[PDB]
Structure formats: structure tokens, C-alpha cells
Symmetry: D2
Subunit: 211 residues, 4 copies
């Protein structure tokens, strides 16, 4: 499962351990489907969340740095990210669509906002490359690059921590850009753990986007 996000981003599921029944078993310490689903709903409605820690996902995510900065605040998870110390960074930036400013009256046209953002990221990358090609170490040269630069990372997260992520990021209070990533994560979670996901939405989910 891979899902395009923003202009150049994505979320892809790399691997998964377990399923709805992993939670039921772990909860039972196990050596019918009606009862297994009822147990899942029971755990979720009563706040017994530890059984869902036995379901684990790994994702590969391509996202702008400002999104990754928010995402990496989720400590109960594992990350490995592309390094600007160790590699030349690619010319790939998130440029908002003109629809991104719908709702806001602006004293310059939304298409001109879009062009101003493109212009400055182009000048910044041009400076970065000039510095690199003059022998400035990569780890110093990259400091001129803007926060809308794309980066990539692997994320390994269990279903309990993923539910926390969805409560906080699949929600109107989160920045729109990370909401879009959260909606993709939710779609994948629903596909792999349908009983857990539906019970989550019904009983435990705290946000206001997923339905």
C-alpha cells in the first residue's frame, strides 16, 4: 500500500507484524470471530490499550522537513531519516497549491504566493549547490535550505502509539499538511486491522476528521 501525499510526498507500508487477533491473543495470553471482535470493542471502550502494542507497522514516508519535525515529536516509535551531513540533498520542495490559502483573504493573489515560495527555494538550493561545489562541507552547506525541503524516513510504530498519533494528527488542530499524512496512515491501519480501527473510531478516537 502506497499513497501519494501533497505535491511530491508519500506514505508506504513496508512491513507489519500481527493483526486484530494479535491483540486478542496477547490479551488472553493464548496458547470465535463474534467473541474476538467483542473483546476488541471491550478493550477499546474500557481503555485497556496495552494489547494493541503487539501489532507493529513499518512505514516509509517522504515529507517536508516542517512536517517531519512535528511527526518526530512522537517518541514512542522508531525513526531512521536521510542525512544532510552524509548525502547531497535533492532539489525537491513542497510548494503549496493555491487552494491551500482558501479561507484567507490575502493582499497578494494566491498564485503569486505560490511563485514567491518557488523563487526563494530555488535561490536557496542554488546557494546550497554553490557552497557544496566550492568545497564547503555538506553538513554546513545544507543550513541555508528551507523547511519545505523534502526528506524521507522509516517509521516503526505499534498500534497503540499509532492511535495516539491519529488522535493528535488526524484532527483539525494539527497543521493541514500533517493531517494529510495522518489520513493516509489511518487508511493503512484500517486495512490491516479493521476490527481495531472500527473499535478505535467508535470508542476511543479523540480527533474530529476520521469518520
Amino acid at each position: 500500500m502506497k499513497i501519494d501525499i501533497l505535491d511530491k510526498g508519500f506514505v508506504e507500508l513496508v512491513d507489519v507484524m500481527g493483526n486484530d487477533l494479535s491483540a486478542v491473543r496477547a490479551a488472553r495470553v493464548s496458547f470465535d470471530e463474534e467473541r474476538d471482535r467483542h473483546l476488541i470493542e471491550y478493550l477499546m471502550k474500557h481503555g485497556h490499550e496495552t494489547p494493541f502494542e503487539h501489532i507493529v507497522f513499518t512505514f516509509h514516508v517522504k515529507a517536508p522537513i516542517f512536517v517531519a519535525r512535528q511527526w518526530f515529536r512522537h517518541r514512542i516509535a522508531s525513526y531512521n531519516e536521510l542525512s544532510g551531513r552524509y548525502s547531497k540533498l535533492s532539489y525537491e520542495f513542497y510548494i503549496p497549491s493555491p487552494e491551500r490559502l482558501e479561507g484567507y483573504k490575502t493582499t497578494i493573489p494566491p498564485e503569486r504566493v505560490t511563485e514567491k515560495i518557488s523563487e526563494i527555494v530555488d535561490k536557496a538550493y542554488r546557494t546550497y549547490l554553490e557552497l557544496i561545489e566550492s568545497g564547503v562541507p555538506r553538513e554546513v552547506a545544507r543550513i541555508v535550505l528551507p523547511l519545505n525541503l523534502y526528506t524521507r524516513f522509516f517509521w516503526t510504530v505499534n498500534a497503540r502509539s499509532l492511535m495516539n498519533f491519529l488522535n493528535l494528527r488526524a484532527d483539525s488542530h494539527a497543521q493541514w499538511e500533517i493531517q494529510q499524512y495522518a489520513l493516509a496512515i489511518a487508511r493503512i491501519f484500517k486495512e490491516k486491522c479493521p476490527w481495531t480501527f472500527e473499535a478505535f473510531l467508535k470508542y476511543a478516537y479523540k480527533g474530529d476528521i476520521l469518520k
Copy 2:
């Protein structure tokens, strides 16, 4: 893979996510085997441990309470255990073999130590059952049961946290009983992640039992 431990215990692998290449990919943020193995050795010799967090195991363990008490100190992991509040606990106790006291001069024969331990656990269980059958709540009745009572749990742990567990518990300083569990865990880890395990032993393992 299931391995008998002590007189009545076991360790069984329930599920696993990933393999040696999960660490190599996560480390590379990947979209030959000589080079993949060399990278693993490189990460291990230099202390780059986060890539190993993307390999995850779930075990089902049957162990005495005093062993479980030590094991559950490992916080960077997930546990679900049989409850003495919620179920009648089974008459199953760890009785040391007479060889357990080899090295120690004792003023009573090692076989008589073994019998004294059996005798007291029998009296304790008899009291527990008397209390249960008189209508004492299970959660109170069980408090008379000794620390050598067997319990069971599911344990979900990533390879980095598992390496920490092995450093501390597959080692002469750990209590012999948990060492035996750690040796089983190591065998399973070696089988599922041979490059990681061998690199761990060569470069990072801090204990004094595994070879």
C-alpha cells in the same frame, strides 16, 4: 520455535517482523549480501543501534513470578500477563533441581532443600484454594502464593531492546534462572537474524555467557 526452560517453563516465538535486511534498509532509507553484512557489522561496531529497532519479536513465556519480576524491569518493551485478580491460578511451581545448589556447602542435603520447597508451596496452594472455595475474592486469596508460582505472558520487543536484555540477562551476574530464559531468547534471535546476532556477539555484546 519453542524451548523448554526450567522444570515447567518455556519460551516460544509467536511472531516476528523483519530480518537482517530490515535494519540495512531502515538504515539506508531504501526504496549485495557482502555489502549488507558489512553494513550490519559497521553499525554494530560503531554504536549505530537505531536501525535494529525495525526488527520486532513477540514471545510467549511461561516463567516463575520471581523471574518475571526481573524481566518486566525492561521497560522498552510490551507485556501482557495472566492475572490473579481475573483467574484461578494453576498449581504449577518452580522446584529447583538438586544441581541448582552445586558449589554451595549446605547443612541439609540438597534433596531435602528440594522437598522443603515442595512442602511449603503445597501448603500455600492448599490455603489459596481453601480461601477461594470459602468465597474470598481471588485477588486477595492469591496473596499467600509464593514467588516460584508459574505465570505466563506475551512480550513484544525490538532487536535493540532485546540486545540490551541479552547484555544484562545472558550474563553470569544475572540470576541463573533468568539466564536460562535469556539463552533461549538468544537462540531464537540468532535463528531469525543471523548477521545481526553474529555482529552483536563480535562487537557489542557485554555479557559473559554467549559465545
Copy 3:
């Protein structure tokens, strides 16, 4: 602040870092009291919990093993506990009061339950000491001791993790014995962080005992 719990237990505050204003500052990234209290209520009502991580407590707790087993499931915290490998364990056991069985019809008198529990713990300790004095290693001898043995530990926990503890343990679903410890912890928390505590009760606390 020290508070007696059960027959022989206690909870004592050893140290604390910070206060209500630590959360306000951390939240503001700070270089009036009406507004500082309003901010605390705001964070709590909206689920902004990370600012409360900057308030930290250390407690010294004396509790029976079966209570400690439940308590030590709280992973987002730090523990150091008395060792039965490293010391001779003291003859101190939790003996329920006869009022502990109020609500339950029992086919033996509650005072006789109390005596049966005393009798078995006395026999168990007598066996433990016999084994110790015959040269059995402490770490083996102790396995005959029951779960109502008292132990002692230091617990270092931040206010966010403490609120989670109180949601789960200051609640009717938790075992009565640990509820009594949780009520003491809550009293200390209220004393040291009154604005945070009152805002917690009003907006975020999930249990059904604290008022």
C-alpha cells in the same frame, strides 16, 4: 510528607522538581496568577499534556509485592527496589483487615481468613530462614515467600505519567490495595501542584474515586 498505607506500608515524598509554574514556563518557553492558572486549565482541557512532564517527583514506597507488581507496569518512570538476591528479607507481610472482605459472603468467618493468611506466611518465612541458615543462597531461598511480603522502592515519575497512574490506579477497577497507595500519591500531588491537580480533576481525570 509521609502517609501510612495498609497495615505496615507507606508513601513518602523524597524530592520534587518544579511546581505549577514549571508547566506554564515550559509551555511558554519563558525567559499574572490569574492568567497562569487559566493557561493550566487550558492545557488540561485541550489535551496539551507535555508541559506537565517538566514537574518531577521522587517517592519512597513500602508496599507488598503484589501491589509493586502492578505499580511497576508503569514504564514511563524510574524504579529502584530492595533485592532478595542481595539482602536477607524482613519478616513483614500484609495481612488484610477483616473489613477487607466486607460485601462478600464467606463460608468461613473473616477473622479466620485473617488467621489462615498469618499462619501460612509464618510457615513460609520459617522455611525461608531454615534454608538461609542451612547455606542455601538467598536468591533461591526467597522463592518460597508469598506475594504479600513487603518490599520498598524509590519511584521517580513526572506529573504527566503520574496523571496516567492516577487515572488507572485511583479508580474502582484497580485492586483496593493499590487504590490506597494512589490516594496517597494524589494527596501529595495536590499539595505540591494545586493548580495542575484541580485542573486535572476538572478536565482530564478518568477515574471514579478522586473528587
Copy 4:
């Protein structure tokens, strides 16, 4: 204690809980100085690290985003940071000194590298302000700002996690800029916990800068 770092940064100690004796007590589960220091050295030389979790610091740090990105990878800690969604961000950027490129042959003079970096950050901030003043939401406008923008955060971290931070960041392999922050953190740690710090350097510290 406050220490200037880089051109415009700082590290300041806001609060601390405990001292060397907190570790000794927690380790002993306590109800002379020669022996207390010997215990600290003992714990450190043998890898008994949990007692140091009972010493906790809070710092206020002003650092460029690229430094903060590395720092916030340390998950076993607590953070609260200034938000570009919620505030107008200040015109403050890290401009490397010309000495930062000592060792590297560059095909443009180090002073001209310094000017090129200043020039691009000035153009970027000018764009950011133009967008803000045209009614673009702050959370979108800020995406044009470079990684050398200064940010500020509160960091609450225990001494065990701080030792891990120092092993990794007070070391030649870490980026020079974060090394400078780590050296300041080490100075503060040494001042507040001299026995722990000296024992750390002697027995456990894995880096190659602190002496």
C-alpha cells in the same frame, strides 16, 4: 548557570532535582562520603545505571533548527519548543564563523561563504515577512525559512539519558555545532553532580572530547 553557544545561542540550567546522593540513596533504598563516592564509581564501572535516573535537569536552550533536529532525536526526555504555527518567528540565524571551515580547502574565500549564507537568510526572512504581511497564515509562511533559524526549547532529562546524550553528542562524530552545546551541558552536569560526572568520564563515557 548560563553559557553562550555559537553566535547567538545559549544553554541555561532552569532547575535540577537531586544530586550525587540521590543516586546513592535510590540505589540503597535509603531511609560516609568515602563510601558514597565509592558506590557511585562501583555503579558506573559495572553498568548499574538506573540509580542515576533519580537526578533530573531542566534546561532552556537557544539553538538553530538543524541542531534542534538532531537533539530532539533523544526520545528519553521531555521537550517544549517555540512554534512557528503559533508565533511570528524572530530574525535570528546562525552564521558560521570563518574558522568553521578550517581544514577544508574551498574555491571561494571563507569570508565570502559567510556572506553568501547571510545573503540567502536575509532574502528568505524578507519573503517570510512579505507573506505574513500579505495575510498568509504563519504556519505556511514559515516554510521558506532556512534550517539555521534559531529556535528555543525547554528540555527535561535525567542523568542517565544525559550520559547517553553526552556519549553521542560530546564526540567528534557528532556535528561540531551540537558538540558545542554538549560541552556546555557537560559543564553544568559536572557542576551539579561532580562524583557522578567524574565516575562517568573514568568508567562509562564513550566519546572522545570530554577529559
